[PDB]
Structure 1
Amino acid sequence: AECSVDIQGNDQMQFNTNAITVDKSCKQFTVNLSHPGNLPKNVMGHNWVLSTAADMQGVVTDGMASGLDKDYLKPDDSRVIAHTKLIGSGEKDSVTFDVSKLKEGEQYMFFCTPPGHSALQKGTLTLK
């Protein structure tokens, strides 16, 4: 809604949106991640990670590398403009960030970093 979106990460390796919209007149933007289903974080955990489209794969491949105890993101990966933490079924985690970190004329991509998840769980974030 007002300066934030609710997104669902389920048991079928999905996000219920591939296009996140951000009103320019938002000083900050909040994302509230939610996980319906009964699979554990260690079997079907998701996160919400944001970067440019050029950096997405680096962030994914490195996040792949770091492991489960790093939530499948690289420590202080400066390619990450913001990210929620890894959540299992029934859990929730929200993230908030400076809307000014999204520079005009750039391509931004949200995605889930566990192994193979981004292939279905990825999308565009737009600073309309």
Structure 2
Amino acid sequence: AQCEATVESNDAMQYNVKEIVVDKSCKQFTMHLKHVGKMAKVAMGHNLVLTKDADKQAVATDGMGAGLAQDYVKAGDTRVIAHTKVIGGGESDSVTFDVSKIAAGENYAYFCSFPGHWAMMKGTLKLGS
């Protein structure tokens, strides 16, 4: 596997990749998000938020309450391993995190915390083996 991944998000509330594998050789990992659509953030912004799979809904719910100016992620949320900014069509963002935060054998989710999107925009991240 690799030490970065790129995920595209679009105007139909989809990510183009459903699984990311972090190579065991990596100390850090970078997630690149592209918004390949034409909708504005007000309507159809997207981010990428990485959590333990069990924490997805709780983080998304707290994120809605945080608002767009907080990238729809609660400030200081200890359940968030990493997140990007919310972007609109024609934009991109990236975030890097320490792979020591990812444990072998655990299930992680990456998802969009823009209101309503997590039900459609979610994949799995795991540490390779």
TM-score (normalizing by structure 2): 0.95
Runs of at least 5 residues in structure 1 that lack an aligned partner in the other structure: none
Using the TM superposition, give the Cα deviation of residue 104 of structure 1 relative to its aligned residue in structure 2, in angstroms. Answer: 2.4
TM-score (normalizing by structure 1): 0.95
Q: Could you say which residue in structure 2 is the equivalent of 1:35?
A: 35
Using the TM superposition, give the Cα deviation of residue 105 of structure 1 relative to its aligned residue in structure 2, in angstroms. Answer: 2.8
Query: Kindly tell me: are residues 126 and 15 of structure 1, through their superposed partners in 2, closer, same or farther at Cα, counting changes over 3 Å?
Result: same
2:12 partner amino acid: Q
Q: Could you say which residue in structure 1 is the equivalent of 2:15?
A: 15
Output the CA distance in 2 between the equivalents of 1:74 and 1:86: 13
Q: Could you say which residue in structure 2 is the equivalent of 1:63?
A: 63
What percent identity do the matched residue pairs reach?
59
Q: Which runs of 4+ in 1 moved over 6 A?
A: none
Which stretch has the larger CA shift, 26-35 or 64-73?
Answer: 64-73
The structure carrying a bigger strand percent of its residues is 2
Runs of at least 5 residues in structure 2 that lack an aligned partner in the other structure: none
Output the CA distance in 2 between the equivalents of 1:38 and 1:54: 32
Q: In the TM superposition, what whole-angstrom CA distance separates every residue of 1:68-123 from its partner, at most 9, and x where no partner exists?
A: 12111111111000011100000010111111110223211100001110111011
Mapped contact 2:47–2:85 kept (Cα < 8 A): yes
Output the CA distance in 2 between the equivalents of 1:110 and 1:4: 14
1:45 partner amino acid: G
Q: Secondary structure of the residue that 1:55 maps to in structure 2? A: helix
Mapped contact 2:7–2:32 kept (Cα < 8 A): yes
Q: In the TM superposition, what whole-angstrom CA distance separates every residue of 1:1-53 from its partner, at most 9, and x where no partner exists?
A: 84111110111111001111111111111111001121111111000100001
* Number of aligned residues: 128
1:22 partner amino acid: V
